[PDB]
Amino acid sequence: MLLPVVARAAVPAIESAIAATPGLVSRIAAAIGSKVSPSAILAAVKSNPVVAGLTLAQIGSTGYDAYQQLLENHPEVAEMLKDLSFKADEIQPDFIGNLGQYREELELVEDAARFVGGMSNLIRLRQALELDIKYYGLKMQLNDMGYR
Amino acid sequence: MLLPVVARAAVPAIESAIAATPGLVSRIAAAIGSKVSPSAILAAVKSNPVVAGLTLAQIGSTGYDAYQQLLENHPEVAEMLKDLSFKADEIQPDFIGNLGQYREELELVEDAARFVGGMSNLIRLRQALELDIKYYGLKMQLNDMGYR
Amino acid sequence: MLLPVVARAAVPAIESAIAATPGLVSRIAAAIGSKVSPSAILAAVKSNPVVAGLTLAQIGSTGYDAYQQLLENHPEVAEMLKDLSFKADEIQPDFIGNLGQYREELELVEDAARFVGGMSNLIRLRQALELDIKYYGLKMQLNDMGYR
Amino acid sequence: MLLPVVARAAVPAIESAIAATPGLVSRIAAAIGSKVSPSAILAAVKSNPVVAGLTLAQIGSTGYDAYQQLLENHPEVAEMLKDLSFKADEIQPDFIGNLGQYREELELVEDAARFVGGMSNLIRLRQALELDIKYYGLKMQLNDMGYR
Amino acid sequence: MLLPVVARAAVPAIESAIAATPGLVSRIAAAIGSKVSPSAILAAVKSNPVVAGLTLAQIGSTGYDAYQQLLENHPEVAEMLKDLSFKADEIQPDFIGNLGQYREELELVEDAARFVGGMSNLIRLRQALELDIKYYGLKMQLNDMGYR
Amino acid sequence: MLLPVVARAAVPAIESAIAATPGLVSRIAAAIGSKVSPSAILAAVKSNPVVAGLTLAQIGSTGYDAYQQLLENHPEVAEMLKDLSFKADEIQPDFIGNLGQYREELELVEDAARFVGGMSNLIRLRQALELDIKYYGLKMQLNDMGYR
Amino acid sequence: MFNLKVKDLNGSARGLTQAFAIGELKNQLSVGALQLPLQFTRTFSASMTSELLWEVGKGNIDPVMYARLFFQYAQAGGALSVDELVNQFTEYHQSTACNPEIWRKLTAYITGSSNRAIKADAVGKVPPTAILEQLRTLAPSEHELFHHITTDFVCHVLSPLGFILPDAAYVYRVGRTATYPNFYALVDCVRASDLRRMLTALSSVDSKMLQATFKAKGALAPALISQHLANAATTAFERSRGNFDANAVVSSVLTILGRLWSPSTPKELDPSARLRNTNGIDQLRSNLALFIAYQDMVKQRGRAEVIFSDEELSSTIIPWFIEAMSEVSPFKLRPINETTSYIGQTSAIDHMGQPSHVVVYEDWQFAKEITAFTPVKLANNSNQRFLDVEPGISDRMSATLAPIGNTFAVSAFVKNRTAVYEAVSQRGTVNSNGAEMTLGFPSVVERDYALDRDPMVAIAALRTGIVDESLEARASNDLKRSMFNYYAAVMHYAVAHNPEVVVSEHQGVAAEQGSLYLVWNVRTELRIPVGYNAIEGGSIRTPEPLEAIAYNKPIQPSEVLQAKVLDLANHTTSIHIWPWHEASTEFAYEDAYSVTIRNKRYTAEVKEFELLGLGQRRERVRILKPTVAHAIIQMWYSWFVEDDRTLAAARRTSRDDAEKLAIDGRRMQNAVTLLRKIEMIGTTGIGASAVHLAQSRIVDQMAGRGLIDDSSDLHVGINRHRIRIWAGLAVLQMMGLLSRSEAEALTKVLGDSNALGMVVATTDID
């Protein structure tokens, strides 16, 4: 059913949100599809972990903490829960065409990348050149003193 | 008897509920079937875990915490506890017939399920189609850049 | 000597009760049989665990917590302490004869018990029959849909 | 030198007692034989555990907690510390002669003890006889119903 | 995905900083390159750890705690994150030449070092000589008493 | 670098001391030899543990806690840190000669010690003799009753 | 697959830790503080056998096995214990035997003649189930298992005379035996010594004399039978009477051992100079299986008491307790080295010495047989139903499964694992943690399938130590009884390879008056400890049986562990009364092989009844589950995806050229050994007939559209290497062996590594 380790934190978290405002109680009753009465949904939470998760998605303010802790002790629901809760991210009309212009550009980076090494290196090497000149002098001088 | 670990936390929870209102004291005395005096039931709680559980069912407000922790302390009382505490869930007159109409429908899902895979997959695949078109364009474009 | 883990909690617990009212100080001095002075008994508590227990029996209000924790770290005294502290439970004049009438009755349950199984089963089976009829219909219908 | 686990609790405990009243600072300086300055003794506490203990004996009010925790992590000092801190318990003039009268009496108990069993048994058996009569009736009746 | 153990602490930490002042929201939106809306960046943090780090660099006041804990559970990002977040340390005009004068000097220490031993030794030996004379007398006297 | 377990506690501890008074900021900048700016030293603390220690020596008020915890997770620096931070203890002019008089005396104790046993024994035996006489009577009497 | 962090043992696996066994739920367990030296040279191991169908109806009595039926009926049946059972048996046996009528009334029925002699010719035949029907009314009981034992008693004395029909038959399944005694399994096996002396009296009645006097004289009254039975049944009633409580035989004799092991036993109660010298304690002193039993004893009772006379009486208890166990029983003493023989160990070593990962696995002999039965009711609303074995379905699969067998042997899995940790690990020490210890126990997952239980509650039983209550008691009773085997099976292993063991006494929290725990002396020759202990002296003393494993060198299992299938074939007629729907899997399958030929999609469906040669789809038949076969494959799947996961986890962070090429060197080399294995399954009898058909549904679907034929120089081969692979899953899918999910991920792994791409690359010359 529901892990006590989770449930310990979970139940009062939900109950707190309910006591905060009634407007959420009707919402979760709609999403989970449970009897609108606050006692009902609280009976459902204990029964199924999948249900417990959807509730904590409906209230993210105070509830985010327990949700993560629920996710820990239950890797099982993690896949299923991820699917049931989903929203299509609104895409910008310009986006896909706007990306089309960078085709020329990214292929240029990856030519520079392969040469240098991993992308991490090139980000470094870029800084080394952009770096102030004095530093090249500094390093030369430490080698002048016989430090390596 | 009663294990001490349960006692440090469990004893004050009940005592608090008693001090809150007298009306519960008479109730638990009836359910557990113990002498109405608050000192009596408190002597019984320590003695048997099964008894301790029924008390915590009578008061769920403050008491729910210890109850769960009692589940961990004694496997046996909880096992014989689930039976002693039971209430017939009131059934709606419409329900069983109302379910009869979905016979046609669920058999349709399970035809679609088996084809795709586990129910988890079909919930995903359903979203993939319902998903906005631009995304299909987006993914095609990343493959155009040689990313995949 | 008294173990520190206990003593840490024990000593201030007793001292608090003393500071609450003097009337207890005379009582514990009588029961433990120690010098009436509050400094004396507090010197005795540290010395012997058995003594420490009897004190915590005399004051159960604030003291019950430490007592249990004393009981944990000392299973040794547990037997001895249980004996030294005892009170004959007042028996009701009606009781033993009142029990005589149930001889006929309990032997009836145990005939029903053995048949069914453990007492736990019979408590269940009793509910199954007492249960509303619709449920028998419900379960039949799920089997009609091919669910096991 | 002093283990941190102790020192963490120990140092502020002492420092608190110092800040409470100056009168203790002069006392501990005398007992430990350290420079009267509060900074000095605090430098000594960190240096030697044996010294740390004697300080916590001088102040028992707030300090008793750390002392026990010091005693845990250092079983070594436990012997030495017990010796350095000692006070002859004032004996009552009547006591030793007053004990002489019980010679006749205790030898009587130990004759009764050996017969019964361990002292724990005799304390029980004594109660069984002192116990009210009805109980003997009660137990006989349960055997009448065929319970054992 | 971001590990929960981190995310638990991370999310409210960021959200707190946002609620503190709006001026940061625009900054992080610029650095991470995300939609200016506070809900957007909070959606990004959960998605990528690398992103989560850059945010916590932008706010160091309240956020430093989680950042380190992020760094623990993710040694992977540690390299990449270190590169993306970088600032050229302003160098003083005098510095490199000012260092040139110590060439003569440091070579003198390392002549003394090798002779004595590790640098740690020489720091000690230097103190031993600088030390007051009486101490040499003190140590001689303990040897006079036959102490070693 | 500095281990997080330490750093978690260390960083805010230092930052708190800085916010308390500016006068320390200039001091630590002198001792560690770092840029006077509070942001600079805080950048140094994270970088090297040895540096982190010297800072916590400069502020002992609030900082002593973390320092010890730093010492735990880093036994390495423990040697090096002990050397870099040192102060010659001012010696009293009278001391060494004042010790010369006890030569005669201590050699007397060690003659008594060897005879008895370890020094711990002699401290006990000394008390046994100093102890009141009645006790010798008491013990004799318990043996008279046949107790050992 | 079960992973534990050996550094923190308490948290990761509390089931196998010793701290749990003696009652410490809290973290603390005493160090090597106080000690006494000891050597365990013997143990009680159950004989190596698993459940078999045995039939109760026929006239024989085989006392050992009826005894075994009581174990199962009472214990796993949900009832309290076999002890309470047997007691209610001898109140039942006293009822009939000591009662003069009940032996007349049912000899009036079987002989037919109340008041007069019966001739020699006129002897009718009464079927065994008959007399049972009436004995039910005469001597009623709540346990049918008693009536069967009396019924086939009278059948045994009357068999020579021929008053009863032989033909009728009937059958039950005896249960599986725990390899090591739980505390109660001692108490049981002591009562079952009584019982076995009971039945050996009933069983041995010849009634040859009654057969002789019947022949010569020509006739005999019921007065001769009905006495001659009553003489037998009261010889058995003698032998029951006056045996000691098992509960107090053992409770004592595990205490008075427990006092001569523990070093700290107060002198106030010391086992005396005589009983210490008793014949037989010497041997029982050095025995292990008792010890871990003792640890259990105190775990529950919390205490102990010696009721029996500390001297005169307790020296006739032991010689009686020895004779109970020592005699042939399920438990037979063996030298300790042998009972752990099948466990084996291998480790992944750093450069210095110490473990990085160390694996412990149970070797297996894969079971190559399978049977398929069809259930047949006797009458509507009657549960008697008896199955018919059908050959020709089973001959297919067992000739299909036999090729699978050779190639999955367990040793080849770990021999593969350590080859992973060679490649993935950096060059540097492991100080960061104790070396994690992975342990394959195919027996665990195996027991989950025959009992139909979520693998997640089984594992999580070992981790936290407590059993979930949500499940019904039939599982928990076989779950805990299981979880105790592994605990025991661990310590027999640890002790076998570290003969030096030392017995302390735990009293830190003062939970019980008497307690015991071993501490091992193992000499590590390592610089840094794994787990946590001071590693001082060039030997480490570790209370945990797991840690004391980790310091072992590699061990090769000397004895294959043997699963064996339940056997339906032998007795066909007998009616099955045991539920067989637990061990039966439904058998049905559907699948579609899709290929794309010249820019279209062609899908060949296929059904299981076609694969088997059956022309029609028959619903009834049910494959009897291939558990141990599904156990192994389940293991080999989880270790495969685990490997292939851990590499692609390092492969990202490698940051080396020399090493990175060694990872992709591994994956590819792994995945194409994966595939050459599945292709090897495709040539099998089901694999064949799956292929022959799939190509044929694809052909006739292309009839309409004329398109050009292939080269098949390599194309016949390329197409061939692909279609086989899909047979390889189809055969695994249709039998239980591989679940549909994991079959998909196993395609995806073989999919992205482009294994097939590399397989063909060896069939061309350039």
XYZ file of C-alpha atoms in Angstrom, chain G residues 110-323:
214
model
C -16.931 -55.080 6.311
C -17.650 -58.738 6.991
C -21.394 -58.236 6.661
C -22.056 -60.758 9.403
C -23.157 -59.663 12.839
C -23.850 -62.849 14.762
C -22.334 -65.715 12.768
C -19.217 -67.175 11.210
C -18.381 -66.409 7.600
C -17.381 -69.211 5.257
C -14.291 -69.121 3.049
C -15.882 -68.793 -0.387
C -18.670 -66.316 0.330
C -16.305 -63.382 0.839
C -17.533 -60.193 -0.813
C -15.470 -57.135 -1.597
C -15.875 -53.728 0.047
C -14.011 -50.750 -1.453
C -11.711 -48.860 0.963
C -13.422 -45.513 0.576
C -16.568 -47.221 1.814
C -15.505 -48.144 5.329
C -14.097 -44.651 5.642
C -17.521 -43.203 4.946
C -18.963 -44.937 7.967
C -15.999 -44.609 10.293
C -16.687 -40.924 9.876
C -19.956 -41.367 11.734
C -18.602 -43.697 14.409
C -15.463 -41.894 15.549
C -15.938 -38.345 14.272
C -13.063 -35.895 14.033
C -12.237 -32.465 12.641
C -9.176 -33.760 10.899
C -9.751 -36.007 7.933
C -6.119 -36.973 8.026
C -6.852 -39.148 11.035
C -9.567 -41.119 9.316
C -7.210 -41.975 6.487
C -4.696 -43.382 8.942
C -7.197 -45.661 10.649
C -8.887 -46.627 7.400
C -5.775 -47.969 5.781
C -4.927 -49.676 9.005
C -7.892 -52.028 8.874
C -7.138 -52.320 5.188
C -3.768 -53.702 6.151
C -4.949 -56.537 8.411
C -7.835 -57.391 6.064
C -5.761 -57.236 2.871
C -4.544 -60.843 3.094
C -8.073 -62.136 3.684
C -9.410 -60.135 0.774
C -12.448 -58.410 2.213
C -11.664 -55.207 0.311
C -11.327 -53.964 -3.283
C -7.757 -53.095 -4.169
C -8.516 -50.942 -7.188
C -9.416 -47.572 -5.647
C -6.566 -45.049 -5.305
C -6.064 -41.529 -3.942
C -3.282 -38.864 -3.640
C -1.720 -35.878 -1.734
C 1.508 -33.858 -1.972
C 3.987 -33.898 0.867
C 5.677 -30.579 1.460
C 9.175 -29.186 1.059
C 11.629 -29.362 3.967
C 13.698 -26.514 5.394
C 17.337 -27.536 5.167
C 18.104 -26.406 8.711
C 15.995 -26.766 11.859
C 14.119 -23.780 13.161
C 13.649 -24.037 16.915
C 10.196 -25.484 16.399
C 11.474 -27.885 13.783
C 13.312 -29.533 16.648
C 10.230 -29.698 18.824
C 8.346 -31.127 15.901
C 10.883 -33.732 14.979
C 10.894 -34.939 18.577
C 7.118 -35.444 18.657
C 7.408 -37.038 15.274
C 9.579 -39.624 16.976
C 6.628 -40.595 19.175
C 4.370 -40.724 16.176
C 6.802 -42.841 14.250
C 6.853 -45.314 17.128
C 3.058 -45.170 17.120
C 2.660 -46.108 13.505
C 5.373 -48.697 13.449
C 3.143 -50.726 15.767
C 0.056 -50.399 13.578
C 2.013 -50.990 10.398
C 3.636 -54.188 11.601
C 0.523 -56.218 12.334
C 0.657 -59.253 10.076
C -2.490 -61.107 11.116
C -0.956 -64.214 9.573
C -2.510 -66.265 12.343
C -5.965 -64.984 11.542
C -5.153 -66.037 7.988
C -4.191 -69.535 9.060
C -7.160 -70.176 11.314
C -9.449 -69.011 8.527
C -8.074 -71.433 6.000
C -8.105 -74.685 7.945
C -11.249 -74.291 10.029
C -12.999 -72.742 7.038
C -14.841 -70.042 8.952
C -14.504 -67.493 11.726
C -16.874 -65.229 13.574
C -16.535 -61.491 13.751
C -15.544 -62.263 17.337
C -12.141 -63.307 16.064
C -11.617 -60.288 13.848
C -13.075 -57.710 16.158
C -10.775 -58.860 18.904
C -7.719 -59.181 16.712
C -8.059 -55.617 15.583
C -8.646 -54.404 19.114
C -5.437 -56.138 20.154
C -3.460 -54.326 17.487
C -4.839 -50.861 18.088
C -4.088 -51.160 21.800
C -0.513 -52.158 21.182
C -0.092 -48.806 19.537
C -1.860 -47.108 22.402
C 0.755 -48.501 24.723
C 3.637 -47.038 22.787
C 2.160 -43.562 22.794
C 1.683 -43.423 26.500
C 4.239 -41.761 28.742
C 6.511 -39.847 26.397
C 7.974 -36.494 27.501
C 6.771 -33.097 26.342
C 8.811 -32.278 23.285
C 8.437 -28.655 24.254
C 10.156 -29.287 27.564
C 12.613 -31.850 26.286
C 14.178 -29.413 23.914
C 13.623 -26.189 25.855
C 15.767 -27.640 28.562
C 18.332 -29.436 26.487
C 18.958 -26.310 24.482
C 19.413 -24.406 27.699
C 21.869 -26.749 29.319
C 23.890 -26.542 26.182
C 23.543 -22.804 26.171
C 25.059 -22.683 29.608
C 28.129 -24.701 28.699
C 28.939 -22.599 25.635
C 28.610 -19.088 27.043
C 31.738 -18.028 28.980
C 29.912 -15.764 31.392
C 27.441 -18.202 32.969
C 26.924 -17.248 36.622
C 28.228 -19.916 38.969
C 24.942 -19.864 40.877
C 23.509 -21.817 37.982
C 26.237 -23.908 36.394
C 25.592 -27.135 34.556
C 26.996 -29.655 36.964
C 30.089 -31.774 36.721
C 28.032 -34.875 35.950
C 25.901 -33.736 33.040
C 28.871 -31.966 31.472
C 30.425 -35.390 31.437
C 27.260 -37.117 30.197
C 27.659 -39.424 27.250
C 26.691 -37.482 24.156
C 26.927 -33.874 25.304
C 30.456 -33.908 23.983
C 29.073 -34.340 20.505
C 26.048 -32.072 20.898
C 28.395 -29.438 22.274
C 30.227 -29.026 19.001
C 27.144 -29.103 16.814
C 26.250 -25.966 14.881
C 22.672 -26.422 13.727
C 21.634 -26.377 17.331
C 23.447 -23.181 18.013
C 21.649 -21.068 15.422
C 18.561 -22.797 16.760
C 19.477 -21.749 20.245
C 19.896 -18.159 19.080
C 16.377 -18.393 17.825
C 15.108 -19.867 21.051
C 16.178 -16.925 23.119
C 15.023 -14.565 20.397
C 11.442 -15.566 21.073
C 10.998 -16.951 24.589
C 13.447 -14.301 25.715
C 14.431 -16.598 28.560
C 14.813 -20.203 29.666
C 14.026 -22.464 32.630
C 15.076 -25.952 33.642
C 12.062 -27.755 35.022
C 13.643 -31.170 34.804
C 15.773 -32.261 37.734
C 19.105 -30.579 37.185
C 20.948 -33.874 37.589
C 19.261 -37.271 37.865
C 16.470 -36.604 35.417
C 18.357 -34.443 32.929
C 20.767 -37.289 32.366
C 18.000 -39.510 31.017
C 16.621 -36.691 28.861
C 19.688 -36.276 26.687
C 20.065 -39.921 25.736
C 16.411 -39.784 24.769
C 16.852 -36.520 22.864
C 19.774 -37.885 20.936
C 17.935 -41.021 19.862
